[PDB]
Amino acid sequence: AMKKIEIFDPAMCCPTGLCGTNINPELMRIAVVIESLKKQGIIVTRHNLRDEPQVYVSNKTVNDFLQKHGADALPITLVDGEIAVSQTYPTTKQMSEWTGVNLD
Amino acid sequence: SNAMKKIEIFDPAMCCPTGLCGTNINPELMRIAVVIESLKKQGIIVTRHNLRDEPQVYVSNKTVNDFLQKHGADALPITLVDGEIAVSQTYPTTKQMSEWTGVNLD
Amino acid sequence: MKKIEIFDPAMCCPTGLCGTNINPELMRIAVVIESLKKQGIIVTRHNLRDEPQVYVSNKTVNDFLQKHGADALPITLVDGEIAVSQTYPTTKQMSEWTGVNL
Amino acid sequence: AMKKIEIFDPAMCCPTGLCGTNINPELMRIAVVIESLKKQGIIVTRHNLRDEPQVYVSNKTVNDFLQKHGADALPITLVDGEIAVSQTYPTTKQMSEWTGVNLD
Amino acid sequence: AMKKIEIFDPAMCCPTGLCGTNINPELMRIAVVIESLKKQGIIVTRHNLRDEPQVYVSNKTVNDFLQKHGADALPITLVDGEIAVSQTYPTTKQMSEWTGVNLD
Amino acid sequence: AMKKIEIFDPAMCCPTGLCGTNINPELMRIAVVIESLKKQGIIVTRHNLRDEPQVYVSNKTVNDFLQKHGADALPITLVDGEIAVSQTYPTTKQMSEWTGVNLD
Amino acid sequence: SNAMKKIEIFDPAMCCPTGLCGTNINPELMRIAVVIESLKKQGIIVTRHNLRDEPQVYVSNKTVNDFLQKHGADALPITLVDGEIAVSQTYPTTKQMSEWTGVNLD
Amino acid sequence: MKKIEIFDPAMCCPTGLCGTNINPELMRIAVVIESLKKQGIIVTRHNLRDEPQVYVSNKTVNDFLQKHGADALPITLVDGEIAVSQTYPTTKQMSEWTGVNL
Amino acid sequence: AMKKIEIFDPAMCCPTGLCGTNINPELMRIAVVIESLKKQGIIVTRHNLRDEPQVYVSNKTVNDFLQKHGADALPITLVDGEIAVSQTYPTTKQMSEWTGVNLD
Amino acid sequence: AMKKIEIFDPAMCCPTGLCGTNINPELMRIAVVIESLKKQGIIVTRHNLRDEPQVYVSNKTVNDFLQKHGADALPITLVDGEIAVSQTYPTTKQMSEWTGVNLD
Amino acid sequence: SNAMKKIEIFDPAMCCPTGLCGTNINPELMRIAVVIESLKKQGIIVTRHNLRDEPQVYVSNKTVNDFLQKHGADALPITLVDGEIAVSQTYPTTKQMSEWTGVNLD
Amino acid sequence: AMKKIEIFDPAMCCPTGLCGTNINPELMRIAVVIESLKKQGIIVTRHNLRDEPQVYVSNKTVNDFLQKHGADALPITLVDGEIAVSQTYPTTKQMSEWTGVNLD
Amino acid sequence: MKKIEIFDPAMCCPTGLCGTNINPELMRIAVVIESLKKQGIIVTRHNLRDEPQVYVSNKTVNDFLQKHGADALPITLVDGEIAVSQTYPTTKQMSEWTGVNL
Amino acid sequence: AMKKIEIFDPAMCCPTGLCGTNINPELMRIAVVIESLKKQGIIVTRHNLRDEPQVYVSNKTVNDFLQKHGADALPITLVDGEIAVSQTYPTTKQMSEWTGVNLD
Amino acid sequence: SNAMKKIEIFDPAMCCPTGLCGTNINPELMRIAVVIESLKKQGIIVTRHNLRDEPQVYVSNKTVNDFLQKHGADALPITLVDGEIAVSQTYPTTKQMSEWTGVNLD
Amino acid sequence: MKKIEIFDPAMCCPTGLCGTNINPELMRIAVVIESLKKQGIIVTRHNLRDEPQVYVSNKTVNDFLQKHGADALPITLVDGEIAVSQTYPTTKQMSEWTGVNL
Ligand SMILES: [Ca+2]
Ligand SMILES: [Ca+2]
Ligand SMILES: [Ca+2]
Ligand SMILES: [Ca+2]
């Protein structure tokens, strides 16, 4: 009943993208969600194209999707290994359904 | 795919921000309002302006202003995509919004 | 097939979708009512701001208001009796009452 | 009138301190506060000892306090130019009372 | 110095509340005051709970007062950020004393 | 001695046109006059082209005038059923003479 | 009919806002002042400027300024109708004011 | 036909129509006097600011001022006696005194 | 901080009152003061009852004072919005003390 | 030893030219000088082309000078009936020498 | 005669506002300083700028700036007469100052 | 709030007084202070009696003090418009306390 | 013909005509000295800021300074004795001492 | 072990170039260094092309360098009579090494 | 020789002001950073901007902006020498920096 | 030839040359290490922020840290023993240890 979630971000300067002075609202929303889930022992793993290029090749699902749609298709979110979202971050509603947690 | 494009829509003067007030009830207005709300839910903001409510923006925005000089106000609504005129007289089709946005609408 | 009738709170326009802030529940039910309308199915709705008298003349709505106040709105009648209060019917409900797949 | 709030962080690798995989919850809390304030037009400026060492010297109130207690006193928060908090970030309650903004 | 006056209306269908056939005389009176003030360069800003729900939450002074007394307390008028009137609109006399403008 | 007054406005977003933030001085003047007369049991009926198109057709005097002069000729004021004013609202002086009241 | 048009009149430099001071006593000035007052009574405002009193407006207003570059100040009075030059050297006739305004003057 | 003569308060110019604020009564009487002038009919007016001596030498105006002060102005004489004080003659009056239809 | 000085003259034929052959020495004295101040960037605004009757009504402090004492009280001088002088113009000494400018 | 001084100004809106809000420094200087001399029973007569055109014709000295140089040559100052200055106002130094007074 | 014309002079960068400091001692600088002072005494102000002291005015003044783009700074001093370039490289002759000013200099 | 500091130097040959071969150490010290302040956006304006004689007369506080003590009292330093120091330049410590800037 | 020599106060440049404020007396005497120079007549001037030693070595100037201080400057010597103190010679004076018509 | 230093500046308005309101940071740095060394009886002589043109000709080293590189090559610093720096002022580090003093 | 020229460099968007962070590690970035630091030591300041950090400067600077309109952002880095485009796509060679600066680099 | 190994303090990037303020000592040692690398000579460096475990497993570095704390960093090992603490090796030192002329 609990689906596993893996996020492949675009190339960013830090794992959360929340480094600099201008805060992207969507990056903050998803980082807060991930940190909430983490507090509860639910791990959403994320990758950064700048830090781990190889996983964007070695994951065949992500690789084939990037071949068709390009790096502009990032972020890609996998749910149980299936592409579930592309170009925007999953909605908190999606994250609650997938994890069975009730996130604000 | 392409990077998502910024979309900003300049409505005619209407009695409410969505045009869904009153009697005429143009289904286009409902189509585009539904699209805008679906995007909002996904964290994508399509900024709208209403001439009746924010007249100063139709001036301050140089692109919108000039187009209006050279076509009149019967050219509203104007939709800018990454700052440039993309559609006028009519609201962007769902196909276009879907293309500019990367979101599979409907 | 069942008759559905909706008594809204007082709103500034018939769908409540006037202002800058769109209530997602209002747009949901408006979209449903428009789809029904296109199937030839008419879900009558009332706005307390414009049709105050119907909230008095419908006895079932009137008695419910005496007991619970405007807080109870919207009220949805289904074949003449209260089926939903305070929130709009779910799309699942509408489909079941109309037999249309929304 | 509006109390001016200015925060002097310890040395960090980015302006919010949210630069790695482990999110320090205090750094996240204060970043979210500053973002919510910024949405209201209220600007809380902050400095990072790593990139602006000079301002920690030229600000007399900060410099005197660090001469006394050392860099371990950071973060220091000034409210209208006076030291209001050191060692820890201001609480959300404090930030709320100083700005007149509900930060729940 | 000039007292800042800011009015938080109940939910209404338009910014002045003068949106139908029956003119509420209090709404008319306060609209005329605000217009006369605006002619003198004095800006009384007002909010409508219907279109700006968020500001009734983010303004701490208004939010605390509504948490306590509920939406029936509206209109609330702030003078220099403090609650000066609730339940009813400020009288013309009050508005006149706060602004130094004769509003007969 | 008291003439009956009926005003046919242009298409407006509300019966008084006083809905939004910018107050047209002439709309406010005429709305205040109408409300004063109303307080005294003198009824000036007004129409809005947006809300009652049909009356702009069914009143032959207004219909024939609109055929010649167009909607740009609105507002049209009838006094005892005769066109008396076009394009501007009647002067308060006119309103006092027609109603026998002494309006400010 | 047409919508009423905005009228703004830029006088020469005169010793008073209406020019009705002193000895010369040009009847045109009286004609236009009477027209302006009749409009005022009906809630229609014709804004006037006097060069002697508000010099900065003859600069800040780009249209007025340029015309003055290219004709001189002997081109005053200038009348703008909806922002554009409509008359110069002389005051608008009553026929024109009447046409721009929808009011039956005289 | 009757002689009309008007003694204004002190004003900044002969018609009082100088400034930004036009007094509608002043423009009314100025327009009347100009129409008369064109019929060949001269209504003499005085301005206290420029012709103080005439307010002394006309005995009727002088005595009225001693009793009522500058408050009494404008004074209109009609065939040499005070006909109007404090406001300008109505257009109806002017027409009657001149026999011209204004 | 700078005291704001605002002068409300009687009705006059021009803004300085220096409009004829006989120079009133008080009008000349105060015009020269205002000119010297203007050279220093200090703006003393003045009003003429003849051309701005409305401001004598809308300014509550001036209006109340004239309701009480009549137009013979003019000139009235406000310093920071309060009545500081009436009947006569402020002395050069007063103007000098209020502005910090030597007006010999 | 005391020379008689007569000034013929350009067309101006009042005898001193000091009527409006913007004060020409030279007009103020010469008006103050004239008023000082007047206080001492020394009369400097001045003319305004707007108020007395005829004297600009009937004075042959001024007439012949205007024929050659035009109205742009005004102001013209006569000293004992001789043209003494043209286009600018006499210097206070000139005025002191001509009158035998020691003006500031 | 003509109305007096406004004269504004933009000096090169000099160690003092008049250039009368030091050793070289160009008699032109003394000529023009004497003229300027004679005018001052008669209530006529010739505004001077020194590039070294007020650099921002050589920018803010659009006319001066453009001329400098298209000729270099070896074009200083520039003299404006009623706002327009009248002389460059050299200071206006006394004949010109006398003509622009209506004053009989020397 | 920021104390405004304004310095009135004696007559000197250049604005800093550093115009010859012998550097007066007090002039150098205060120039360096003013430069460091200017780097922080804090403007200490200064005047030179030689080039701005007029401001020493029009500033009433300075003028009164010089009338009393003569030019030998210069430099005079005003802090918020009041005399704070005369005869000598303010010490670096004073400048530091008035501005909140560490000037070591 | 008489030798003229001028000892200025300390000034920022040899004529004192450096700054934004021109002292009319300084320009007057500078113009005179330049006209003389052109007639081949040299009026030597000293600036206390640059030539302090000459104010000591000229005994007449030195003694005058001991008694009256820098307040006495400018001092003008004419054939070696003090002719003017505290103000510059008038143009009339210069003409008389040089025999040139200035 | 102590090298003699002579600086030939560009044409400047005063020996230090520190005369005017805008302070060139490099001119201030080198002037402070020179003044420090002077306090210690170490004399760095400097020339100004405006004040001593002749020394720029009579020093053959400077003369030959200017023939090749032009006045734009100034400032030229000699150390024991050898060109050591051109176009910029010597670094404080250079000055310390050359003089054997430890300058800040 | 020539007067030293002002040099201002507009970097691409990078994760740090020098680009010396991470993995790729373009030796050009190290070359230019070393040059910039050698100049700094001699009191010569080469101002750098990073698009990621100071986006507003890439707008406010009209020259940089226009070039970007007409070439794209793949034209970064742009180097201005006395305000004008001198190099794009690549960082100035040490020879150029040395020439613009009068400093013998390396 | 001697093995050189450098244990940096925690830094934000491998050379510490990330930010707006360049530490001249860091650029000096980075330039040296790059020149060595080009001679085929590898001076391994560690960053405490990314490789914490190596500061524990190297016993010599570990014991030094227990005694002196992170204050001791950077530590330079030369043939396995501490040669420099708290500052980076001088270029002279690097040349001597590598035998390369830097
Ligand atoms: Ca601590
Ligand atoms: Ca209540
Ligand atoms: Ca009185
Ligand atoms: Ca002393």
Side-chain angles (χ1 to χ4, degrees), chain H residues 16 35 43 47 52 61 63 70-71:
Chain H
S35 294
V43 170
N47 172 358
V61 165
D63 295 338
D71 278 345

Side-chain angles (χ1 to χ4, degrees), chain K residues 14-16 21-23 52-53, chain N residues 12-14 19-21 50-51:
Chain K
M14 305 181 301
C15 289
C16 64
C21 26
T23 55
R52 159 165 177 277
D53 290 342
Chain N
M12 316 188 292
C13 301
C14 62
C19 0
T21 39
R50 173 172 175 274
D51 302 333

Side-chain angles (χ1 to χ4, degrees), chain H residues 48-92:
Chain H
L48 177 61
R49 200 168 118 118
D50 299 330
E51 318 157 45
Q53 64 290 350
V54 79
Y55 290 69
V56 174
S57 72
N58 183 300
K59 242 101 164 297
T60 291
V61 165
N62 181 88
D63 295 338
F64 207 76
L65 291 177
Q66 310 264 45
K67 181 160 168 56
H68 303 286
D71 278 345
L73 298 167
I75 294 167
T76 301
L77 301 185
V78 167
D79 282 337
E81 61 189 359
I82 290 160
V84 194
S85 177
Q86 299 201 281
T87 56
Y88 290 99
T90 67
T91 298
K92 193 205 178 214

